[PDB]
Short mmCIF file of C-alpha atoms in Angstrom, two decimals:
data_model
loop_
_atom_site.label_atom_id
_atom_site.label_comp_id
_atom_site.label_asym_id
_atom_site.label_seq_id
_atom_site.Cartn_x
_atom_site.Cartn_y
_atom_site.Cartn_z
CA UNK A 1 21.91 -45.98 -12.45
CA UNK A 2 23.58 -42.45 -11.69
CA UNK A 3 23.84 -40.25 -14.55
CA UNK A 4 27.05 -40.22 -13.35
CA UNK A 5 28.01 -44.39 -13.60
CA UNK A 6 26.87 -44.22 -17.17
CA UNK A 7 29.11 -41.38 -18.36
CA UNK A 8 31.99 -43.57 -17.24
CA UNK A 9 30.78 -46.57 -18.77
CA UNK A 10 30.24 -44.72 -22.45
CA UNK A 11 33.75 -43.07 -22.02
CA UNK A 12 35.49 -45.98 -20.59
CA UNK A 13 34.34 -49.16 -22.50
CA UNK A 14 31.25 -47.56 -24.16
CA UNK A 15 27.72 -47.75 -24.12
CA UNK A 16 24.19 -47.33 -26.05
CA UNK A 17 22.35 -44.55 -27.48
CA UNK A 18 19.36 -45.99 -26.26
CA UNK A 19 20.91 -45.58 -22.52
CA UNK A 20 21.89 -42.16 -22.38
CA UNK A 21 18.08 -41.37 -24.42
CA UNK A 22 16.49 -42.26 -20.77
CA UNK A 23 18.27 -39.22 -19.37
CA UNK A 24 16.46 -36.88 -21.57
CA UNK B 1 17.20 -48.43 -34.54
CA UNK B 2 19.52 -45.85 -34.28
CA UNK B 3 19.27 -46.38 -30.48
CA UNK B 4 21.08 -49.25 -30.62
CA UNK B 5 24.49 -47.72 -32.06
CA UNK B 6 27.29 -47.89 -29.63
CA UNK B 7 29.37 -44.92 -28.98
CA UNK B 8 32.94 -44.24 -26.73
CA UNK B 9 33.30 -40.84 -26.04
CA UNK B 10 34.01 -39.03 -22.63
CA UNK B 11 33.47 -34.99 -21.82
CA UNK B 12 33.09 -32.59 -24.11
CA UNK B 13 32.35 -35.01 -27.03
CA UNK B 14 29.48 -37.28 -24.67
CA UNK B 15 27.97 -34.02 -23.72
CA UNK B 16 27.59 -32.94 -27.78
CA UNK B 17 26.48 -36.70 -28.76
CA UNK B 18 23.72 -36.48 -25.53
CA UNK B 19 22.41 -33.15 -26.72
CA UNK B 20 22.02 -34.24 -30.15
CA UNK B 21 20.66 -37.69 -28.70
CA UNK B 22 17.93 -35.89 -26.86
CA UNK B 23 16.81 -33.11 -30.27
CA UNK B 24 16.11 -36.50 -31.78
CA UNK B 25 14.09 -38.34 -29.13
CA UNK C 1 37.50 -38.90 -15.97
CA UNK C 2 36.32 -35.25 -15.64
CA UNK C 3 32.34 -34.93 -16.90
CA UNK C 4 31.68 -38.29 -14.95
CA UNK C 5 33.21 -36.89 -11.81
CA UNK C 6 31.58 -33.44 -12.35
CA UNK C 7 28.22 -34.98 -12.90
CA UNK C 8 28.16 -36.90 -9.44
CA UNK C 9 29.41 -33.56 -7.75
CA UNK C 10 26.78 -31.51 -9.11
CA UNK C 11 24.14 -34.69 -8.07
CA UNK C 12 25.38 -35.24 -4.50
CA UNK C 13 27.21 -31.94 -3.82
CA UNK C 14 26.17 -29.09 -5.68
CA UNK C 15 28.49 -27.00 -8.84
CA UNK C 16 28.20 -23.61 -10.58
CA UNK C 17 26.79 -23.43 -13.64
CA UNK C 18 29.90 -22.07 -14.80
CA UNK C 19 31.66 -26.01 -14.16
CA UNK C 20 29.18 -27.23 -16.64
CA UNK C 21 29.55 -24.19 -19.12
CA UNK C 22 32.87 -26.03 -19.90
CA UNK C 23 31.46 -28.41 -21.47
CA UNK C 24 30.04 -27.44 -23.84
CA UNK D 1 26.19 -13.50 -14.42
CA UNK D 2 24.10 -16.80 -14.34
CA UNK D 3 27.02 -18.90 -14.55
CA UNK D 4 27.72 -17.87 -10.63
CA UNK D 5 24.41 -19.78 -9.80
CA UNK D 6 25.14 -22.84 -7.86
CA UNK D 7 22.59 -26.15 -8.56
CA UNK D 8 22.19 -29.21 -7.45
CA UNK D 9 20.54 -32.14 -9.66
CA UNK D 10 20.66 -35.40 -10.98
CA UNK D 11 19.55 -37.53 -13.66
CA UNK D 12 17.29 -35.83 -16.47
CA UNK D 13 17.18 -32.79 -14.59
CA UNK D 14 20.76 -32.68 -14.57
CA UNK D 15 20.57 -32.99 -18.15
CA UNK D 16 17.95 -30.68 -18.90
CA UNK D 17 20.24 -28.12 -17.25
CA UNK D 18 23.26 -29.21 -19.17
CA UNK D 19 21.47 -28.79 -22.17
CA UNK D 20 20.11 -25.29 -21.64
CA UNK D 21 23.01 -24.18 -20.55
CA UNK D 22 24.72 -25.27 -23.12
CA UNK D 23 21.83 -23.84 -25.68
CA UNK D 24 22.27 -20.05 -23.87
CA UNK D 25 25.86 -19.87 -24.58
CA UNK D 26 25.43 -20.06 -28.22
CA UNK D 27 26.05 -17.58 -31.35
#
């Protein structure tokens, strides 16, 4: 999962905490 | 948990909600 | 549109730190 | 300046960098 895919999916229809706290 | 919240935010706000995502795990 | 696009340049590409300074 | 330096990363250490960066430039 790019980094990069899941910034457009929280900004765009949204997304987890939990997803973005495996980037850490 | 608190993991499980959704959020919708793009630039400058994601960037402030992933910093304070990571001081707290 | 912008931080997601930024985020694959700086991960395939390359970017200043400067780009990411903005967001913050 | 620093902010001239030129990276390339992804993932976590993409975000690592965001965050310090974003932790220097602070008051």
């Amino acid at each position: 999962q790019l980094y990069s895919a899941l910034a457009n999916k929280c900004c765009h229809v949204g997304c987890t905490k939990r997803s973005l706290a495996r980037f850490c | 948990s608190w993991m499980e919240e959704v959020i919708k935010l793009c630039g400058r706000e994601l960037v402030r909600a992933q910093i304070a995502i990571c001081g707290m795990s």
